[PDB]
PDB file of C-alpha atoms in Angstrom:
ATOM      1  CA  UNK L  20     -14.022 -55.600  23.638  1.00 16.57           C
ATOM      2  CA  UNK L  21     -16.045 -56.615  20.555  1.00 15.07           C
ATOM      3  CA  UNK L  22     -17.303 -60.122  21.415  1.00 18.20           C
ATOM      4  CA  UNK L  23     -18.245 -59.285  25.002  1.00 16.27           C
ATOM      5  CA  UNK L  24     -19.885 -55.941  24.362  1.00 13.96           C
ATOM      6  CA  UNK L  25     -21.811 -57.105  21.361  1.00 13.63           C
ATOM      7  CA  UNK L  26     -22.882 -59.982  23.560  1.00 12.90           C
ATOM      8  CA  UNK L  27     -24.234 -57.274  25.890  1.00 16.63           C
ATOM      9  CA  UNK L  28     -25.930 -55.570  22.899  1.00 17.90           C
ATOM     10  CA  UNK L  29     -27.114 -59.076  22.041  1.00 19.00           C
ATOM     11  CA  UNK L  30     -28.538 -59.176  25.597  1.00 16.08           C
ATOM     12  CA  UNK L  31     -30.422 -55.883  25.189  1.00 15.33           C
ATOM     13  CA  UNK L  32     -33.744 -57.503  26.126  1.00 17.25           C
ATOM     14  CA  UNK L  33     -32.520 -58.100  29.630  1.00 18.21           C
ATOM     15  CA  UNK L  34     -33.871 -54.608  29.839  1.00 18.10           C
ATOM     16  CA  UNK L  35     -31.995 -52.270  32.095  1.00 21.32           C
ATOM     17  CA  UNK L  36     -29.765 -49.235  31.207  1.00 24.39           C
ATOM     18  CA  UNK L  37     -26.837 -50.675  33.238  1.00 26.25           C
ATOM     19  CA  UNK L  38     -25.303 -52.781  30.520  1.00 25.01           C
ATOM     20  CA  UNK L  39     -26.038 -50.069  27.951  1.00 28.13           C
ATOM     21  CA  UNK L  40     -23.806 -47.505  29.565  1.00 25.27           C
ATOM     22  CA  UNK L  41     -21.380 -50.331  30.475  1.00 29.49           C
ATOM     23  CA  UNK L  42     -21.246 -51.243  26.775  1.00 33.87           C
ATOM     24  CA  UNK L  43     -20.754 -47.585  25.822  1.00 33.48           C
ATOM     25  CA  UNK L  44     -17.902 -46.683  28.163  1.00 31.78           C
ATOM     26  CA  UNK L  45     -16.262 -50.109  27.808  1.00 30.80           C
ATOM     27  CA  UNK L  46     -16.157 -49.912  23.999  1.00 29.88           C
ATOM     28  CA  UNK L  47     -15.008 -46.292  24.257  1.00 29.84           C
ATOM     29  CA  UNK L  48     -12.115 -46.785  26.667  1.00 29.33           C
ATOM     30  CA  UNK L  49     -11.019 -50.127  25.365  1.00 28.02           C
ATOM     31  CA  UNK L  50     -11.117 -49.211  21.669  1.00 31.15           C
ATOM     32  CA  UNK L  51      -9.174 -46.086  22.709  1.00 33.57           C
ATOM     33  CA  UNK L  52      -6.598 -48.609  24.117  1.00 34.03           C
ATOM     34  CA  UNK L  53      -6.757 -50.427  20.769  1.00 33.82           C
ATOM     35  CA  UNK L  54      -6.031 -47.130  18.997  1.00 36.07           C
ATOM     36  CA  UNK L  55      -3.172 -46.569  21.471  1.00 37.47           C
ATOM     37  CA  UNK L  56      -1.728 -49.895  20.246  1.00 37.34           C
ATOM     38  CA  UNK L  57      -2.259 -49.103  16.547  1.00 39.55           C
ATOM     39  CA  UNK L  58      -0.500 -45.738  17.040  1.00 39.39           C
ATOM     40  CA  UNK L  59       2.261 -47.393  19.142  1.00 37.94           C
ATOM     41  CA  UNK L  60       2.832 -49.627  16.111  1.00 38.71           C
ATOM     42  CA  UNK L  61       4.087 -46.599  14.216  1.00 36.29           C
ATOM     43  CA  UNK L  62       5.837 -45.427  17.445  1.00 34.20           C
ATOM     44  CA  UNK L  63       7.701 -48.789  17.778  1.00 34.12           C
ATOM     45  CA  UNK L  64       8.375 -49.004  14.081  1.00 33.97           C
ATOM     46  CA  UNK L  65       9.764 -45.466  14.075  1.00 32.43           C
ATOM     47  CA  UNK L  66      12.015 -46.390  17.012  1.00 33.48           C
ATOM     48  CA  UNK L  67      12.995 -49.403  14.845  1.00 34.49           C
TER      49      UNK L  67
ATOM     50  CA  UNK R  29     -41.664 -61.917  14.503  1.00 33.07           C
ATOM     51  CA  UNK R  30     -39.725 -59.922  17.234  1.00 31.03           C
ATOM     52  CA  UNK R  31     -37.844 -62.643  19.141  1.00 28.56           C
ATOM     53  CA  UNK R  32     -36.770 -64.612  16.078  1.00 31.59           C
ATOM     54  CA  UNK R  33     -35.770 -61.703  13.910  1.00 29.35           C
ATOM     55  CA  UNK R  34     -33.896 -59.856  16.605  1.00 31.87           C
ATOM     56  CA  UNK R  35     -32.214 -63.212  17.214  1.00 29.53           C
ATOM     57  CA  UNK R  36     -31.127 -62.932  13.618  1.00 30.75           C
ATOM     58  CA  UNK R  37     -29.997 -59.318  14.201  1.00 32.91           C
ATOM     59  CA  UNK R  38     -28.329 -60.757  17.324  1.00 33.69           C
ATOM     60  CA  UNK R  39     -26.628 -63.254  14.957  1.00 31.57           C
ATOM     61  CA  UNK R  40     -25.347 -60.462  12.626  1.00 32.40           C
ATOM     62  CA  UNK R  41     -21.733 -61.642  12.988  1.00 31.79           C
ATOM     63  CA  UNK R  42     -22.523 -64.825  11.192  1.00 30.91           C
ATOM     64  CA  UNK R  43     -21.751 -62.462   8.345  1.00 31.72           C
ATOM     65  CA  UNK R  44     -23.816 -62.944   5.214  1.00 31.61           C
ATOM     66  CA  UNK R  45     -26.544 -60.728   3.726  1.00 30.45           C
ATOM     67  CA  UNK R  46     -29.032 -63.628   3.609  1.00 28.98           C
ATOM     68  CA  UNK R  47     -30.432 -63.278   7.069  1.00 29.30           C
ATOM     69  CA  UNK R  48     -30.341 -59.495   6.776  1.00 27.56           C
ATOM     70  CA  UNK R  49     -32.817 -59.406   3.882  1.00 29.47           C
ATOM     71  CA  UNK R  50     -34.639 -62.297   5.557  1.00 27.87           C
ATOM     72  CA  UNK R  51     -34.942 -60.188   8.719  1.00 26.22           C
ATOM     73  CA  UNK R  52     -36.116 -57.188   6.650  1.00 29.01           C
ATOM     74  CA  UNK R  53     -38.890 -58.835   4.596  1.00 28.71           C
ATOM     75  CA  UNK R  54     -39.985 -61.053   7.508  1.00 26.44           C
ATOM     76  CA  UNK R  55     -40.414 -58.116   9.918  1.00 25.41           C
ATOM     77  CA  UNK R  56     -42.117 -56.152   7.098  1.00 25.05           C
ATOM     78  CA  UNK R  57     -44.696 -58.743   6.056  1.00 24.23           C
ATOM     79  CA  UNK R  58     -45.372 -60.167   9.476  1.00 24.88           C
ATOM     80  CA  UNK R  59     -45.655 -56.812  11.239  1.00 24.02           C
ATOM     81  CA  UNK R  60     -47.998 -55.884   8.383  1.00 22.15           C
ATOM     82  CA  UNK R  61     -50.041 -58.945   9.488  1.00 21.79           C
ATOM     83  CA  UNK R  62     -49.858 -57.699  13.050  1.00 17.07           C
ATOM     84  CA  UNK R  63     -51.224 -54.373  11.817  1.00 15.30           C
ATOM     85  CA  UNK R  64     -53.935 -56.264   9.954  1.00 13.01           C
ATOM     86  CA  UNK R  65     -54.911 -57.764  13.305  1.00 15.23           C
ATOM     87  CA  UNK R  66     -54.884 -54.425  15.165  1.00 15.58           C
ATOM     88  CA  UNK R  67     -57.102 -52.892  12.481  1.00 17.52           C
ATOM     89  CA  UNK R  68     -59.344 -56.009  12.448  1.00 17.88           C
ATOM     90  CA  UNK R  69     -59.811 -55.337  16.178  1.00 15.18           C
ATOM     91  CA  UNK R  70     -61.682 -52.178  15.258  1.00 18.18           C
ATOM     92  CA  UNK R  71     -63.337 -54.106  12.390  1.00 20.78           C
ATOM     93  CA  UNK R  72     -64.584 -56.870  14.708  1.00 19.86           C
ATOM     94  CA  UNK R  73     -65.515 -54.332  17.429  1.00 20.75           C
ATOM     95  CA  UNK R  74     -67.448 -52.282  14.877  1.00 19.62           C
ATOM     96  CA  UNK R  75     -69.297 -55.472  13.782  1.00 17.04           C
ATOM     97  CA  UNK R  76     -69.966 -55.984  17.456  1.00 16.47           C
TER      98      UNK R  76
END
Protein backbone atom coordinates (compact mmCIF):
# COMPACT_ATOMS: atom_id res chain seq x y z
CA UNK A 1 0.00 0.00 0.00
CA UNK A 2 2.83 2.51 0.71
CA UNK A 3 5.46 1.68 -1.93
CA UNK A 4 2.98 1.25 -4.79
CA UNK A 5 0.79 4.25 -4.05
CA UNK A 6 3.65 6.60 -3.38
CA UNK A 7 5.01 5.29 -6.67
CA UNK A 8 1.73 6.55 -8.15
CA UNK A 9 2.18 9.87 -6.33
CA UNK A 10 5.74 9.71 -7.68
CA UNK A 11 4.16 9.31 -11.13
CA UNK A 12 1.91 12.37 -10.69
CA UNK A 13 3.23 13.94 -13.89
CA UNK A 14 1.68 11.23 -15.99
CA UNK A 15 -1.12 13.72 -15.61
CA UNK A 16 -4.60 12.23 -15.31
CA UNK A 17 -6.94 12.08 -12.28
CA UNK A 18 -7.30 8.28 -12.58
CA UNK A 19 -4.28 7.30 -10.51
CA UNK A 20 -5.03 10.14 -8.07
CA UNK A 21 -8.41 8.74 -7.02
CA UNK A 22 -6.92 5.24 -7.31
CA UNK A 23 -4.19 6.30 -4.87
CA UNK A 24 -6.80 7.84 -2.56
CA UNK A 25 -9.23 4.94 -2.28
CA UNK A 26 -6.43 2.35 -2.31
CA UNK A 27 -4.57 3.96 0.60
CA UNK A 28 -7.91 4.47 2.39
CA UNK A 29 -9.24 0.90 2.15
CA UNK A 30 -5.91 -0.86 2.49
CA UNK A 31 -4.68 1.18 5.45
CA UNK A 32 -8.10 0.48 6.94
CA UNK A 33 -7.19 -3.19 6.53
CA UNK A 34 -3.83 -2.44 8.20
CA UNK A 35 -5.73 -0.87 11.11
CA UNK A 36 -7.94 -3.97 11.17
CA UNK A 37 -4.76 -6.00 11.67
CA UNK A 38 -3.37 -3.70 14.36
CA UNK A 39 -6.67 -3.91 16.27
CA UNK A 40 -6.84 -7.67 15.70
CA UNK A 41 -3.45 -7.82 17.41
CA UNK A 42 -5.15 -6.74 20.62
CA UNK A 43 -8.08 -9.03 19.76
CA UNK A 44 -5.82 -12.07 19.32
CA UNK A 45 -3.71 -11.12 22.35
CA UNK A 46 -6.88 -10.74 24.43
CA UNK A 47 -8.02 -14.20 23.28
CA UNK A 48 -4.52 -15.34 24.30
CA UNK B 1 14.34 23.38 -11.60
CA UNK B 2 10.96 21.53 -11.75
CA UNK B 3 11.89 18.07 -13.07
CA UNK B 4 15.01 17.67 -10.92
CA UNK B 5 13.58 19.01 -7.67
CA UNK B 6 10.33 17.14 -7.94
CA UNK B 7 12.53 14.13 -8.62
CA UNK B 8 14.08 14.91 -5.22
CA UNK B 9 10.59 15.26 -3.70
CA UNK B 10 9.87 12.00 -5.54
CA UNK B 11 12.91 10.58 -3.72
CA UNK B 12 11.66 11.71 -0.29
CA UNK B 13 11.92 8.18 1.10
CA UNK B 14 15.67 8.22 0.78
CA UNK B 15 15.08 9.80 4.16
CA UNK B 16 17.48 12.59 5.10
CA UNK B 17 16.85 16.35 5.41
CA UNK B 18 19.70 17.16 3.00
CA UNK B 19 17.73 16.92 -0.24
CA UNK B 20 14.75 18.60 1.46
CA UNK B 21 16.60 21.85 2.15
CA UNK B 22 18.40 21.40 -1.18
CA UNK B 23 15.00 21.20 -2.89
CA UNK B 24 13.81 24.26 -0.96
CA UNK B 25 16.67 26.66 -1.67
CA UNK B 26 17.12 25.36 -5.23
CA UNK B 27 13.47 25.95 -6.16
CA UNK B 28 13.60 29.31 -4.36
CA UNK B 29 16.70 30.75 -6.04
CA UNK B 30 16.15 29.21 -9.45
CA UNK B 31 12.47 30.15 -9.71
CA UNK B 32 13.62 33.60 -8.62
CA UNK B 33 15.87 33.48 -11.69
CA UNK B 34 12.84 32.37 -13.75
CA UNK B 35 10.94 35.40 -12.43
CA UNK B 36 13.97 37.53 -13.34
CA UNK B 37 13.55 36.26 -16.90
CA UNK B 38 9.80 36.84 -16.99
CA UNK B 39 10.32 40.43 -15.76
CA UNK B 40 13.22 40.91 -18.18
CA UNK B 41 10.75 39.99 -20.92
CA UNK B 42 8.90 43.22 -20.17
CA UNK B 43 12.27 44.97 -19.75
CA UNK B 44 13.50 43.82 -23.18
CA UNK B 45 10.10 44.47 -24.78
CA UNK B 46 10.07 47.97 -23.27
CA UNK B 47 13.56 48.59 -24.69
CA UNK B 48 12.10 47.31 -27.98
